[PDB]
Write a protein that binds this ligand. Structure first.
Ligand SMILES: CCCCCCCC/C=C\CCCCCCCC(=O)O[C@H](COC(=O)CCCCCCCCCCCCCCC)COP(=O)(O)OCCN
Ligand SMILES: CCCCCCCC/C=C\CCCCCCCC(=O)O[C@H](COC(=O)CCCCCCCCCCCCCCC)COP(=O)(O)OCCN
Ligand SMILES: CCCCCCCC/C=C\CCCCCCCC(=O)O
Ligand SMILES: CCCCCCCCCCCCCCCC(=O)O
Lengths: 334, 635, 244, 334, 244
């Protein structure tokens, strides 16, 4: 601390000493000069200079001391307000660099948001020919051809709806809303939506709903139903899907169970991860596996919990644990 | 392109590299102006001394201008040699030889004349300081005042204009001469020259040991020995650099095995090949440094004698020859309120033989040993010793004699009288003087005989070698008090300056040797600066020839912090040898004649060597700052 | 010993960016003699530079003998590259004001091995490369081939881990090159030390164990040699290069 | 900067001058020291101090001028090498700021690369069901609805394939390749793709290709050809297309002449602008409008000149000038 | 262009007289890259003196474009070499006080010619050699290879016809020497100019197309190259030099 100040100002102490030595020499080599008085003045000046040096060090070495700690300090305002131009120079340079960095980061984020915006827009103008194809597909007569075309329409429609909902799941935080929802009619229309797939694959269903009222977002609850039902249907064949709704404790649970081929015991807990797809059959390579992870991610803002009970060769049981009504008392208050 | 702007860039680049040259130029101009201003000051005549006075500065100036001119000429013939890679290029592009001269004689004239103009400006404010320094060694009071002394400017301008004319002549003689677009193991002789040089130096020192001893004692036999000593010393010093350094370096190399570290490989590489080329300059440097140091030491040793010999030459504070003058001066002192303890003593001159008491050789004759004229005094007059018959006690120390006249212990001492000779024995030697040097010839001591024997010796009164005055008329002084008024009374009594006073012989010697030391010291400082700059101006080339070596070593993992460490030792080995050789030369030259000036050594020599070493190692420190710059840009 | 994990490097002058690494990550274990080659404008030389401490790695992670050396200061990195990573350069890089024995012993003046141990180690190194007859001869008296052997002997005296050779056999005739390569192969056989070498000569690469053909910053397969005939591997690498 | 230096060190000079003034005062006021022998000391000390200050200014005021010279424009290494201890900490802080900015930029670039990879995977999983729907749709038996579903298949194809051209033009500059190309198979493939739609619009193809070989790249010129053909058609209704290629001198020119509505003269220069869509017909809303600008930005490195001869009510003549074959020898040989 | 016949260099200092050159007949035409090579003590410097007209010629009949130098005076010789001949030296000679650009523009800044053509010429030379980005740097802050390239380019701006060259590898390592030789070979093709060197480096002599061997003068046994693979030619050159 003191050592740096001394080793920097070593060029002025030498000048002071040289001045004192020259004055003493000239006073000594003269016949009309009192040597003792000059010596006394030299001693007094040395003492006063030492005191002045102490004060100068103490006052001076603060700005660089603060900016030295600033380099890895968590805060950024640790730099003291400058009082000397030689420090205001560094302050100006650092402030300019910081503001340039901030502006660059903001510009990059803004550009990314815009490009996502054009992507979703183009998704919409691709969606319009999709409903054109839906109309033309609704307009045939042959049972087999209509069934196949409707199945392909439904598959591609659900894929691109999943992708569009993946685009908006980045800012789903902006459209949260909680209201009462009836389950049975919504399930009926959702089952009607998946008619082509179950017609082609001959998959049955069972409906057992003891509970009728839940609390979530209508569109998001419908999308959760879509995710679970499409996953079960694509992972089951010619099986009766047993759905059960009951209040376990203070939480409403929606237990849906299929009777498909099941999942290998080694891979049971890995369903919720990104990209998890079946590898037993070569037909499942093209599958995405993205819906489960995004459903898990955006399940938290709706306070909906998912539980899985899967067995190989028997089926998979999925539980949708709705949160307590009294747990929404805190949410509404906040 | 842009001739003027190119010349300006070249001038700035030259000014950045060569700054010690500008410093030396300004320092030389300052001293020359100071001495020339001091010579013509009307107050210089207050320096009373045996020497003329203001006729010595006329020698100092003429002997200083030679060194300045030699240094400037050698520096300007070193500078131009490092600019051939540009002369060749300008010669091949198409510029003739009558434009290159104007290119390289406009980047030098501005620098030289600016330094000259600055030197005259800064020589005005140091003349008073030099005068005040001078009027403190000679111990005189004056009223030194500041003035310009317009006579010095003409001398300075003429001298330096002539030197510059010579420089231009030499430069023009080189450019259109060497041009025409032109862009190891030891031998048998080299294994003998080093031994020959070392043995020559050693035998020269051994011969220098004796000189004024028991041998060679003849008025003309010393000169041949001294000339042989000087010749052998110079030849050995020359042969030392051209062959003996190689031998020692070879032994040290083929004694380490094969495990050489970085410091040794950086050190031995330079001074086994580069010191051999420079063998005509280090000799001059060493000899001149030794001469200056020795002369300065003696001039300070003789300052201690300027006090002891003035106290001792006159036994009392005054000495008087004429009875009437002494009595009238005493009458004047009577109303001066001065209580003088006067004592007088008759003095007799008798010859004796002391050939049997000298333990040296008959060559130490200094006259007939059987007929040395000595001073004999009575026992009653002496108040400190009570001698008896048949016994004699010598008086005085006379440091010369102990190294010249060696005296034995109690033997037999015969007195060469007219018709009798008594045997006496040597009891002891005293130190104080009871007789002024006038009565006892040059430096011969005085003997004391018994009062009883004095009653026969004075009655005999051999009338052959007796002095004109047989007395020691001399007035003493009371306790330490005011003496100046008695001094001018003494001078106004004696207008024939034939009496000797204690406080007047202590001034002429002091003034003379003060002037000698003043001149020698300033000349030595000038030569120190010159030699430092000259030795610094070759390390640039030696380092720019070693730049590739650094680059190669740097690809093997070595860091700059180690190359600088090795350079810090290479520079010490480069700058140490001449200084050590000069110090040995000075110490082995001074000791031969320390007992001819004063009676105290080891006092001045240490101070002189310490000051010289510091002022010479400043330049040694001022070279790693260029070595580091060379290393940094050798990536 | 040397594991590489997606080392990045882009050559830029702050205005134009030219990437030269395009997905390189090499897995190298102890005691194997490899060779890196391919094209003329390829980044194989840049790859060898960035792998060592000569050039800084833009993005990625490297591991030399278990140590992670990417994000560490220059002083300890210099200490690492001094006490590991011996080198053989394209040129000799020898001093003329020294002898051969002093040249191949100067880099050992940092640890102070006294004198007897240094002499024994120097004798052991020299009697294998056949330079013990030239202990006290200046470098300007020996043939050009012997200087390369002297440089190799200097490089193989402090026992480093990875030996970044860079085209040693570039300015020699057939006989001296064959002898030098045979000596290097024998010394690799005796002393366990990984040698990474770059070359353009097929006969030069024939002595190696594995060959990597970097083409425009890509893997593009790799040979394995094995217990095969030397000539058969020679024509194999000839036809592989002819395919390129 | 003399003023800044004098202001900065405004204490040491004051102390020295105060000492000189005190010495002068004590010499003047006390009738015991000669006043003519102290002015010399003051003069010498002042001279030495002035020289020292002049020599110190240059060595001190360098770093804080280099810092402002660099500022924030470029050449981050233009700052001088720190020598004194104080400037080392400032240099360290600046280096840390620069390193943090570099890390932020690298993270942003990595995130952009990841999102690009995700969208490209979405493109792949759109392009495989494209093949699926192709093979399923090319199995039905009707005629009018067949033409319907056929031209929407090509409509989706257009926008989705244009998205591949967009993602490719994001890095287009590294895919140059020059060799001879036959245009007749390309034209026949384009017609076969647009067979049903051209038949529905009743557009005949008058193909007489006098020229046989051209020297350019295939993919982006093919894109330009389909884009120009689609534009010329959508500025037309029930008109015959005259496809004429003639070896005009040393360059090949495709003069496509139609009988469409044309372009109004006041808006001819604005057709090539980004985002331009024709407002005369409502059927042109389905056109993306990004194809023309993408073709222009891709053809600038290709040295392609397009000549337009559009007459309102008579048709539109588009003439594209192939670069001369000898012009690409500088690209092949060098 | 050059037809060197009867190469005679006289001697006879004090009493000893040496026939270092004993009469050699030399044939080159337009656009060759010939380099004569010998051994130490064969007077390569004297080869420069007799060929490059550095000193005064003694005897012989050699004509540049049919202009014999033995029927023409000293000042006329200086003018002829300054306006018709160029040189490249062993160690680069660049003024430190000037800039990279100023050093190359110096030779043309003495004839009082228009500025725009000089700027265009410097643009072309810098772009074709690769030192364009360094237009405002000093010779103290650039490496050896860049300095040597600038020195080589200095002689390609005064509208030259023939550029001599002594060994351009004394102060360069292998990488810089290879880059310089490749650049010079490319310059030979773009603008037609004959380059003659006499070097001691077989690597630097492998780049040539016609190599001439001497031992004391007239000895020939020159090679032809023609369609060699550029490496077997190097081996043959080294073998022939070793044998002879
Ligand atoms: C008896 C009376 C004695 C009076 C003695 C007075 C002599 C002192 C006076 C004036 C010195 C004139 C000669 C030295 C000045 C030339 C040095 C100089 O100015 O170089 C400039 C920068 O300064 C330097 O780099 C050199 C620094 C040297 C400081 C002055 C040193 C001169 C005296 C020290 C000699 C010490 C020897 C002592 C031995 C007894 C140009 O360099 P740059 O790299 O271009 O940087 C430019 C900044 N933007
Ligand atoms: C080659 C060796 C170089 C060493 C330095 C040489 C500098 C050249 C200058 C002056 C030569 C002085 C010789 C040595 C001094 C002798 C010491 C001595 O005599 O003792 C006493 C000291 O008095 C003196 O001699 C004056 C000493 C002043 C010399 C100062 C030493 C450095 C000289 C450099 C001055 C020039 C620089 C000008 C710009 C700063 C004399 O008696 P006192 O105690 O003063 O009492 C008087 C009445 N009470
Ligand atoms: C031989 C006489 C010595 C005294 C000379 C007096 C004149 C001094 C003049 C000014 C000195 C200025 C040089 C100081 C340079 C900066 C100091 C430093 O960097 O260490
Ligand atoms: C009192 C006499 C001795 C004085 C010793 C100090 C004199 C100044 C020493 C340094 C001068 C040069 C400083 C900068 C040199 C450089 O950067 O090249």
């Amino acid at each position: 601390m003191i050592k740096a100040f001394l080793i920097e100002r070593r060029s002025w102490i030498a000048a002071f000493l040289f001045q004192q030595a020259l004055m003493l020499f000239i006073a000594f080599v003269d016949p009309s000069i009192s040597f003792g008085n000059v010596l006394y003045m030299v001693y007094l000046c040395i003492l006063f200079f030492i005191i002045f040096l102490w004060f100068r060090y103490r006052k001076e070495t603060a700005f660089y001391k603060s900016l030295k700690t600033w380099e890895n300090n968590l805060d950024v305002t640790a730099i003291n307000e400058p009082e000397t131009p030689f420090e205001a120079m560094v302050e100006r340079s650092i402030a300019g660099q910081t503001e340039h960095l901030k502006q660059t980061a903001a510009r990059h984020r803004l550009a990314l948001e815009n490009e996502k915006d054009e992507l979703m827009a183009w998704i919409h103008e691709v969606k319009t020919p999709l409903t054109a194809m839906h109309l033309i597909i609704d307009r045939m007569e042959e049972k087999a051809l209509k069934s196949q075309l409707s199945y392909e329409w439904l598959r591609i429609h659900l894929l691109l709806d999943q992708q569009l909902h993946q685009k908006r799941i980045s800012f789903i935080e902006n459209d949260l809303s909680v209201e009462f929802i009836q389950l049975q009619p919504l399930i009926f229309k959702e089952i009607k939506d998946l008619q082509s797939w179950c017609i082609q694959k001959g998959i049955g269903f069972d409906i057992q709903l003891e509970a009728k009222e839940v609390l979530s977002d209508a569109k998001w609850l419908a999308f959760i139903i879509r995710q679970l039902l499409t996953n079960a249907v694509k992972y089951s064949e010619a099986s009766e899907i047993e759905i059960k709704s009951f209040q376990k404790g203070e939480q409403t649970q929606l237990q849906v169970k299929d009777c498909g081929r099941g999942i290998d015991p080694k891979d049971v807990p890995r369903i919720f991860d990104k990209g998890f797809t079946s590898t037993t059959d070569h037909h499942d390579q093209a599958s995405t596996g993205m819906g489960l992870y995004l459903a898990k991610k955006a399940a938290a803002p709706l306070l909906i919990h998912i539980d899985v009970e899967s067995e190989f060769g028997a089926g998979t049981v999925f539980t949708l644990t709705f949160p307590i009504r009294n747990q929404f008392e805190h949410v509404i208050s906040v | 392109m842009n001739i003027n702007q190119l010349i300006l860039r070249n001038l700035k680049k030259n000014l950045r590299n060569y700054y010690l040259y500008v410093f030396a130029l300004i320092f030389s101009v300052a001293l020359y102006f100071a001495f020339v201003t001091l010579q013509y000051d009307p107050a210089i005549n207050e320096v009373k001394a045996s020497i003329k006075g203001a006729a010595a500065i006329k020698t100092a100036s003429i002997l200083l201008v030679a060194v300045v001119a030699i240094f400037i000429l050698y520096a300007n013939t070193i500078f131009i040699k490092r600019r051939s890679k540009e002369i060749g290029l300008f010669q091949l592009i198409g510029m003739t030889k009558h434009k290159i001269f104007r290119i390289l004689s406009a980047e030098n004239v501005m620098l030289y004349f600016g330094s000259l103009a600055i030197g005259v400006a800064a020589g005005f404010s140091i003349s008073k300081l030099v005068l005040m320094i001078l009027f403190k060694i000679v111990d005189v009071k004056a009223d030194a005042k500041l003035h310009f002394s317009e006579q010095a400017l003409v001398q300075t301008v003429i001298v330096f204009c002539g030197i510059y004319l010579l420089i231009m002549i030499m430069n023009y003689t080189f450019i259109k001469k060497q041009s025409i677009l032109s862009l190891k193991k030891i031998s048998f002789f080299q294994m003998l020259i080093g031994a020959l040089g070392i043995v020559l130096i050693l035998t020269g020192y051994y011969v220098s040991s004796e000189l004024f001893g028991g041998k060679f004692k003849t008025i003309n036999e010393l000169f041949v020995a001294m000339s042989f000593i000087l010749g052998s010393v110079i030849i050995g010093t020359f042969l030392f650099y051209k062959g003996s350094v190689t031998f020692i370096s070879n032994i040290i190399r083929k004694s380490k095995g094969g495990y050489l570290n970085i410091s040794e490989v950086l050190s031995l590489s330079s001074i086994m090949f580069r010191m051999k080329s420079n063998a005509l300059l280090l000799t001059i440097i060493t000899t001149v440094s030794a001469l200056a140091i020795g002369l300065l030491s003696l001039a300070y040793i003789s300052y201690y004698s300027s006090e002891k010999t003035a106290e001792q030459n006159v036994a009392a504070d005054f000495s008087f020859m004429n009875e009437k003058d002494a009595k009238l001066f005493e009458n004047k002192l009577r109303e001066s309120n001065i209580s003088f303890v006067k004592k007088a003593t008759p003095v007799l001159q008798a010859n004796v033989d002391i050939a049997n008491i000298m333990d040296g050789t008959p060559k130490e004759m200094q006259g007939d040993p059987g007929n040395m004229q000595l001073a004999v005094v009575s026992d009653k007059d002496v108040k400190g010793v009570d001698v008896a018959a048949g016994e004699a006690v010598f008086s005085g120390y006379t440091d010369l004699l102990q190294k010249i006249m060696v005296f034995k212990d109690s033997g037999v001492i015969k007195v060469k009288s007219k018709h009798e000779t008594q045997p006496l024995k040597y009891k002891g030697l005293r130190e104080e003087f009871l007789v002024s040097y006038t009565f006892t010839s040059g430096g011969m001591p005085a003997v004391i005989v018994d009062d009883s024997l004095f009653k026969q010796l004075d009655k005999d009164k051999d009338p052959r070698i007796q002095l004109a005055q047989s007395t020691f008329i001399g007035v003493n002084v009371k306790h330490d008090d005011q003496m100046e008024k008695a001094n001018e009374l003494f001078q106004q009594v004696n207008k024939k300056n034939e009496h000797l006073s204690r406080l007047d012989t202590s001034a002429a010697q002091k003034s003379l040797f003060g002037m000698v030391m003043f001149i020698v010291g300033f000349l030595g400082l000038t030569f120190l600066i010159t030699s430092g700059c000259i030795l610094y101006f070759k390390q640039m080339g030696e380092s720019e020839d070693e730049k590739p070596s650094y680059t190669i070593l740097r690809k093997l993992g070595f860091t700059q912090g180690d190359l600088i460490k090795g350079i810090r030792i290479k520079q010490m080995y480069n700058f140490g040898i001449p200084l050590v050789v000069g110090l040995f030369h000075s110490y082995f030259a001074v000791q031969s004649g320390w007992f001819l000036f004063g009676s105290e050594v080891w006092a001045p020599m240490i101070m002189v060597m310490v000051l010289y070493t510091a002022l010479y190692s400043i330049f040694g420190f001022l070279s790693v700052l260029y070595y580091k710059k060379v290393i940094k840009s050798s990536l | 010993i040397l594991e590489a994990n997606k080392i990045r490097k882009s050559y830029g002058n702050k205005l134009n960016k030219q990437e030269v690494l395009k997905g390189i990550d090499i897995h190298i274990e102890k005691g194997e003699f490899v060779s890196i080659m391919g094209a003329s404008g390829s980044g194989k030389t840049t790859l060898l530079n960035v792998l060592s401490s000569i050039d800084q790695v833009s993005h990625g992670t490297i591991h030399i003998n278990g140590n992670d050396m990417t994000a560490m200061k220059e002083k300890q990195l210099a200490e690492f590259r001094k006490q590991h990573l011996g080198f053989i350069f394209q040129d000799y890089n020898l001093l003329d004001t020294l002898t051969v024995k002093e040249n191949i012993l100067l880099p050992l003046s940092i640890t102070k091995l006294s004198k007897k141990e240094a002499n024994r180690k120097f004798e052991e190194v020299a009697k294998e490369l056949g330079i013990y007859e030239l202990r006290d001869k200046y470098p300007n008296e020996i043939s050009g081939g012997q200087k390369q052997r002297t440089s190799a002997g200097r490089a193989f005296i402090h026992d480093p881990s990875i030996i970044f050779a860079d085209e040693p056999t570039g300015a020699l005739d057939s006989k001296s090159a064959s002898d030098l390569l045979n000596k290097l192969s024998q010394l690799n056989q005796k002393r366990n030390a990984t040698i990474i070498m770059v070359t353009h000569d097929p006969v030069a690469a024939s002595y190696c164990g594995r060959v990597i053909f970097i083409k425009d910053g890509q893997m593009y397969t790799q040979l394995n040699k094995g217990g095969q005939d030397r000539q058969t591997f020679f024509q194999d690498i000839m036809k592989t290069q002819g395919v390129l």
